[PDB]
Design a protein around this ligand. Structure first.
Ligand SMILES: CO[C@@H]1O[C@H](CO)[C@H](O)[C@H](O)[C@H]1O
Ligand SMILES: CO[C@@H]1O[C@H](CO)[C@H](O)[C@H](O)[C@H]1O
Ligand SMILES: CO[C@@H]1O[C@H](CO)[C@H](O)[C@H](O)[C@H]1O
Ligand SMILES: CO[C@@H]1O[C@H](CO)[C@H](O)[C@H](O)[C@H]1O
Ligand SMILES: [Ca+2]
Ligand SMILES: [Ca+2]
Ligand SMILES: [Ca+2]
Ligand SMILES: [Ca+2]
Ligand SMILES: [Mn+2]
Ligand SMILES: [Mn+2]
Ligand SMILES: [Mn+2]
Ligand SMILES: [Mn+2]
Lengths: 232, 232, 232, 232
């Protein structure tokens, strides 16, 4: 079997295993701050440097994975807490969209909200142009920020949130479990054929964005991942 | 929302939060040993004392849950390592089947392998009478030990295994991620409508069994659980 | 360590984790109203269903706990605002006293004011037969409503009151911090050996009562609790 | 009554309500980092600017207070995680000791471990010269880092810890409740006569320190406080 696994309790700038793109910054406490609070239409993204092979054209197998991470979003004075964080999977050549308006595109799509990626979003702002639900929410995105499926959620300022994601190759099911600060959990699952939406080699990472009037702190505190592809 | 959550790093006999049924024993190290190595057709089960309400007839909602636990199986001299452990959900009145033959019924079904429960089994013995696969395996069981779906696996003696289970109420999907000793992960997912197979109030627990010639150590080391039911 | 913890932001009738005794009712907003405004000598009690083990006869250890809750008392027309709320700890078999006269017994003691419990009372009526102080007050009760110790307080109609309680096993000190509507805090502490007054297994809950002429609204809005017993 | 209350969800440099002393730094996420990871014998302290009157020479009363705060300690590469954090109360003229060696003095005492303060310490290093216990611990300090009383504890890297403290004027009891990451709580209480150890006006704050080889991240995330002195 082909297995890739890593664990980050703290991040550091200069670690060859991580790729920073945009306004990403590494705080003294090891946390990653994705956006710059003083920039208009800010966008920051962090990726695992090494491309992971999620499927083989030789065998036809797709890999399974288990990943968990914790994040924190916090309100800043005078600005609307926006726009949110997104865990995504994209081709190995992925770069922040050219002329990115930040904001509701979460730093992964164009102005229409289209792009080439698959991901789970923790959206803290209702963008009517992308058909966002009227409340904070978690959603499964397949090549667009106009979510395929969403579920009501609640973002608490200064709260450490924990997430666990499981992808089962056989059923092609992607399920997420979000453990809120108060103990409550929120789940969402959707069938996504990674083999038909993405290429053999891909990169995993997080992205966040803001606008002119919408800004807040987007922190990534830890991240562990394991994937296994049956090579036979 | 209605949330139930608990965390067990070590177990102790005398804790009103746990129900012991059968040959269950609590070791000095805080571990739970499910079966008795000196008994024929031994059976031991441990349940969370408080019944959890997984669905409401009033609203029609089903709860979502996230649970993780670690176990260990170890070979003993002269006996075949059998038969395995099973994480199950059953009605609040659940008791070890009358005249239980232990063995391949995992302590949850009658001789035909039928019963009233939903669970995930870590089977270390191929019982042809229940249509078991020819190797160790993980399987989803709905009211029977003749698994609805299974996936090849490998039980390593003396190895601590970790499991994470997510049930999404919306899709009614139950997904499991098993992290082996060597780092590799095994997953299996299946759609199970809990509202149609079980009653409003249920109990969660683990069960293990042996036979005359099949016996091994079955240990439960830790267990954390959280469920949330939307009451609206 | 043996830890029991729960959190209630809202209560609902039908939740197996809660035991209702007496005139208790669950409002549409999730609050619990303890007494019935239309009944003479009304009494209502709510308990956490699962019995908690506060001490072990095996080791000799007593547990420590931290609990916080918020309540509201409101005046109704023509009736004297009485009699008050009481946070108590009693044996697992605890029931409203037979032939309870409600009133100044707070639904936990007999006519002489004796009973088997430990609790903190927020008394809004001076009952001279139980040697009550001449003003509203908070008191520590050990098997009697004739308080071991009391401190002047002031009950404000329609005001949300917050309370935090800490019990330190080592010193066997029980301290209470009451945060009034206007910001001021009131505290009271007393040494109470739980191991000598109560049995190994107990139940936690609140109780309220009224009389013929004394009636008012008694609301419980939220409640969180955590206890840890060192099992070694 | 005389009441002083404040609440900090995030800290900012430039807020006249806070006094920074030493290597204190305010991160972009609003957290306060007490020590400098690149300095030998680093020391950082933060105090509430306004002096609080804990007792009156006119009446003879002592104030009661309820305070809660959350912190985080994190391991850095190559350095021993030391030395810890301390919540303290000292005279209004309090300054970092002259020629402070940092380390085991927690930035509040001289080399002998003597000083003029009262506080609760979260010690992550056993300094034999101050008679420290052999494990991590919480302790009550009265004018010395050679704790009057301590209790075993465990510091988990990257874990958000919550603490609640209550001081009852009548009994002169100070009790602390520490809620660990895994849910368990730790408590410690001690009788301390504030009126005989400190002057009428004092200042509240936190302090942290490191040495040459001992360094780690010390963060203060939030802090709320309320004190009430009966003026009559
Ligand atoms: C006016 O633009 C909108 O501003 C919001 C905050 O107010 C969000 O950032 C949206 O993404 C953005 O489109
Ligand atoms: C006939 O006994 C069989 O023995 C095995 C070990 O050999 C297992 O325990 C099987 O369940 C049991 O059916
Ligand atoms: C005449 O009965 C009294 O009524 C009061 C209000 O007037 C309180 O309820 C007292 O407990 C009760 O003894
Ligand atoms: C010899 O210096 C010591 O270093 C330790 C870490 O190893 C701690 O910092 C002690 O306080 C300090 O006294
Ligand atoms: Ca949005
Ligand atoms: Ca079998
Ligand atoms: Ca009274
Ligand atoms: Ca020390
Ligand atoms: Mn969205
Ligand atoms: Mn099987
Ligand atoms: Mn009274
Ligand atoms: Mn110490």
């Amino acid at each position: 079997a082909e297995t890739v696994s890593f664990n980050f309790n703290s991040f550091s700038e200069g670690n060859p295993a991580i790729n920073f793109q945009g306004d990403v910054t590494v705080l003294s406490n090891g946390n990653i701050q994705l956006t710059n609070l003083n920039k208009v239409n800010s966008v920051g993204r962090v990726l695992y440097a090494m491309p992971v092979r999620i499927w083989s054209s030789a065998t036809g197998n797709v890999a399974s994975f288990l990943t968990s991470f914790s994040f924190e979003m916090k309100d800043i004075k005078d600005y609307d807490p926006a726009d949110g964080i997104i865990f995504f999977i994209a081709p190995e050549d992925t770069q922040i969209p050219a002329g990115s308006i930040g904001g509701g595109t979460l730093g992964v799509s164009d102005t229409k909200g289209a792009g080439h990626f698959v991901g789970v979003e923790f959206d803290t702002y209702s963008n009517s142009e992308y058909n966002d639900p009227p409340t904070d929410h978690v959603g499964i995105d397949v090549n667009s920020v106009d979510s395929v499926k969403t579920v009501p959620w609640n973002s608490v300022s200064g709260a450490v949130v924990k997430v666990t994601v499981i992808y089962d190759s056989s059923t092609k099911t992607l399920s997420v479990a979000v453990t809120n600060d108060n103990g409550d959990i929120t789940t969402i699952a959707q069938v996504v054929d990674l083999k038909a939406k993405l290429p053999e080699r891909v990169k995993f990472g997080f992205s966040a964005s803001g606008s002119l009037g919408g800004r807040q702190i987007h922190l990534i505190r830890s991240w562990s991942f394991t994937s296994t592809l049956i090579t036979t």
